[PDB]
Structure 1
Amino acid sequence: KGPVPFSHCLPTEKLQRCEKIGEGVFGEVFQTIADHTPVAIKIIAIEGPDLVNGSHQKTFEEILPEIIISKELSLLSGEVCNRTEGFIGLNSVHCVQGSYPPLLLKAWDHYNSTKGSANDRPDFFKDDQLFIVLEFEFGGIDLEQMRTKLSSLATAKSILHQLTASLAVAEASLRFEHRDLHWGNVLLKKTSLKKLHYTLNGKSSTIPSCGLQVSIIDYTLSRLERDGIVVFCDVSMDEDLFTGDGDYQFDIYRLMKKENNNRWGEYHPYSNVLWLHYLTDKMLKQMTFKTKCNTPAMKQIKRKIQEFHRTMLNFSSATDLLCQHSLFK
């Protein structure tokens, strides 16, 4: 077949509505709308010689694991025995060719002026440059940007409960590890559902939403298996992944390496526990709740979450936490 122009993924009206909503070393994420429905578009340069955001571009083979894992996780919303909507929907993947669309560069510029960017302005790509364009369901706003917007300690418990269940279901279905579940990768969207449903090994349960649906995104470093074929990112030789400081996030990579003996092909669901611990730590230390923590009931929820924080590292997986931890009774 071969690639398609950016205009294929982003016809005039869709392109005009693109706004930048995030970034990483991988490239750029734009929100737009199609058939009256918001979507997020992740654009990753591939196969070219230019350094991008400090790193070499991936080949098509190197980007396949992300695509495969994005598809498997998206599929869980539709399964029976192990079902959850707690990841993100994947709509489509395309291989696109061109220089960066001028309208996306303007959107890039607007973000850089308001939020600041840690990326290079993507204005040096030639007309034959390839990209992978992944279109996802819009999952709302990341937990870091929502750190002053959560209502109450009940909201915090619901988010942790949703995260834990989603991970457990992915563990059970796919021997999944996220491996990079920093707070940019947890999305919150308003829902009018009072409770959310999941199914773990044929058993269905619900979790009070407190008005929010959580989505886990970005499977760049993730791992799973299907048909006893493991799909993963081998970061054994990536030293700078392990040398960060100034946030507990950067200890999580070191602690994962310790757990797995630097062997990233193996299944170690304890990594999901480590990420949950980091998120629980964020809930306790970096959130300013709109209703603060002002009643005996809210204080009690805070105490239960601190207890979770002090105990949860003695569990072996998200599935073990969900099924056995007192917080979820």
Structure 2
Amino acid sequence: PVPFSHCLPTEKLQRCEKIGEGVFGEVFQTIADHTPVAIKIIAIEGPDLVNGSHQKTFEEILPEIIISKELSLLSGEVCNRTEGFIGLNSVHCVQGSYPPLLLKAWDHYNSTKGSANDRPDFFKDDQLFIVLEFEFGGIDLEQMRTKLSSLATAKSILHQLTASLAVAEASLRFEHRDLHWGNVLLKKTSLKKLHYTLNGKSSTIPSCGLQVSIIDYTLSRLERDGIVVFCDVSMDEDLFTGDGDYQFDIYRLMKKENNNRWGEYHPYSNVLWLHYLTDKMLKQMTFKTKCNTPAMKQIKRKIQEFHRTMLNFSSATDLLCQHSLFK
């Protein structure tokens, strides 16, 4: 292991601002070489509860590391190519107490947005962490609830998500398994069209000025050459007992689909998450401009039709290739 200063030299540490959190740990934004990055910091291997939960072991965090690398690499592949995941810049194992400068950033977020986490100030100098440095992907869909232009933008977002998932199905037999709206990031792009390649066939998606990135592979599954990497939640109690959001039904519906066998490949889980996201677009997102052109009112009807038909498709690949929304 390395000190925090290896990943976060002084200027980079000084520029850290907290941008997100979960039970897992903390997410900061910083800048180096004029380019923003997101730094995800996860405590591992220790005996303390953190945010009310036990810390993962190194063996338990390896799947996320592996999957983050494989999905990042899809941006540079040929037959199955997409930029719709997030870039992975580096992964380090760090040892030390939490940097005071990160505690300062943590406090500022707590003061302004509020935190559900413990202040991470109780770690000793032998504590291990995994520090994942990603591309900065933009702002999550949940925080953009009231910020998008119109349902035209929603269509682009759903198309981008579907295409990315299809490319990952095709290359990696990938299932995200936790694609809630905090895990869909939106960044401005000057590109009018985005490009992907699925089993050697290239196509484009009108961007509506945004590039989508799918993040957070903590529950994800994939395989290469018959070796499966996944999170076995078969004995998890709490994952399947949520309520108050369709999100929590998706965990139950995944478990029904896979008979509680999480190592198997069930790409229908990607369709379930896409349905949950379409449902958010129609029910919880609110747009600056409502549909008032015949072209826009047709777009709304088409997204409604997607919502009521998409659960009859077997995978994100099937949706992309066969659904009328994308023709």
Aligned to 1:7: 5
Aligned to 2:141: 143
Determine the C-alpha separation between the residues in 2 that align with 1:72 and 1:235: 21
Q: In the TM superposition, what is the alpha-carbon distance from 1:271 to its structure 2 partner?
A: 0.1
Determine the C-alpha separation between the residues in 2 that align with 1:247 and 1:266: 26
Determine the C-alpha separation between the residues in 1 that align with 2:294 and 2:238: 45
Determine the C-alpha separation between the residues in 1 that align with 2:57 and 2:251: 24
Determine the C-alpha separation between the residues in 2 that align with 1:297 and 1:289: 16
- Percentage of matched positions with identical amino acids: 100
Determine the C-alpha separation between the residues in 1 that align with 2:292 and 2:51: 44
Q: In the TM superposition, what is the alpha-carbon distance from 1:259 to its structure 2 partner?
A: 0.1
Q: How many residues align?
A: 327
Deviation per CA, 1:159-207, whole angstroms, max 9, x where unpaired?
0000000000000000000000000000000000000000000000000
Deviation per CA, 1:70-113, whole angstroms, max 9, x where unpaired?
00000000000000000000000001111111111111111112
Q: In the TM superposition, what is the alpha-carbon distance from 1:293 to its structure 2 partner?
A: 2.2
Determine the C-alpha separation between the residues in 2 that align with 1:64 and 1:257: 23
How do 1:237-316 and structure 2 match up within 5 A? 237-316=235-314
Determine the C-alpha separation between the residues in 2 that align with 1:300 and 1:109: 47
Determine the C-alpha separation between the residues in 1 that align with 2:106 and 2:296: 41
Deviation per CA, 1:257-300, whole angstroms, max 9, x where unpaired?
00000000000000000000000000001111111222222221
Deviation per CA, 1:139-170, whole angstroms, max 9, x where unpaired?
00000001111111110000000000000000
Aligned to 2:200: 202
Determine the C-alpha separation between the residues in 1 that align with 2:98 and 2:112: 21
Determine the C-alpha separation between the residues in 2 that align with 1:268 and 1:127: 43
SS in 2 for 1:292: coil
TM-score (normalised: structure 1): 0.99
TM-score (normalised: structure 2): 0.99
Determine the C-alpha separation between the residues in 2 that align with 1:116 and 1:180: 24
Determine the C-alpha separation between the residues in 2 that align with 1:218 and 1:72: 13
Q: In the TM superposition, what is the alpha-carbon distance from 1:118 to its structure 2 partner?
A: 1.4
Determine the C-alpha separation between the residues in 1 that align with 2:84 and 2:263: 24
Deviation per CA, 1:223-244, whole angstroms, max 9, x where unpaired?
0001210000000010100000
Q: Where does structure 1 differ by over 6 angstroms across 4 or more consecutive aligned residues?
A: none
Q: In the TM superposition, what is the alpha-carbon distance from 1:128 to its structure 2 partner?
A: 0.8
Determine the C-alpha separation between the residues in 2 that align with 1:55 and 1:266: 27
2:318 to 305, 317, 320: 320
SS in 1 for 2:103: helix
Determine the C-alpha separation between the residues in 2 that align with 1:288 and 1:299: 15
Determine the C-alpha separation between the residues in 1 that align with 2:106 and 2:283: 32
SS in 2 for 1:264: coil
Instruction: Specify every segment of 5 or more residues in structure 2 that has no aligned partner in the other structure, as ranges.
Output: none
Instruction: Specify every segment of 5 or more residues in structure 1 that has no aligned partner in the other structure, as ranges.
Output: none
Deviates most, 36-45 or 109-118 = 109-118
Determine the C-alpha separation between the residues in 2 that align with 1:279 and 1:216: 12
1:167 to 162, 165, 168: 165
Deviates most, 33-42 or 292-301 = 292-301
Determine the C-alpha separation between the residues in 2 that align with 1:162 and 1:41: 24
Q: In the TM superposition, what is the alpha-carbon distance from 1:8 to its structure 2 partner?
A: 0.9
Determine the C-alpha separation between the residues in 2 that align with 1:249 and 1:58: 24
Deviates most, 263-272 or 56-65 = 56-65
SS in 2 for 1:4: coil
Q: In the TM superposition, what is the alpha-carbon distance from 1:9 to its structure 2 partner?
A: 0.6
Deviates most, 269-278 or 97-106 = 97-106
Q: In the TM superposition, what is the alpha-carbon distance from 1:24 to its structure 2 partner?
A: 1.2
Determine the C-alpha separation between the residues in 2 that align with 1:125 and 1:304: 52
Aligned to 2:84: 86
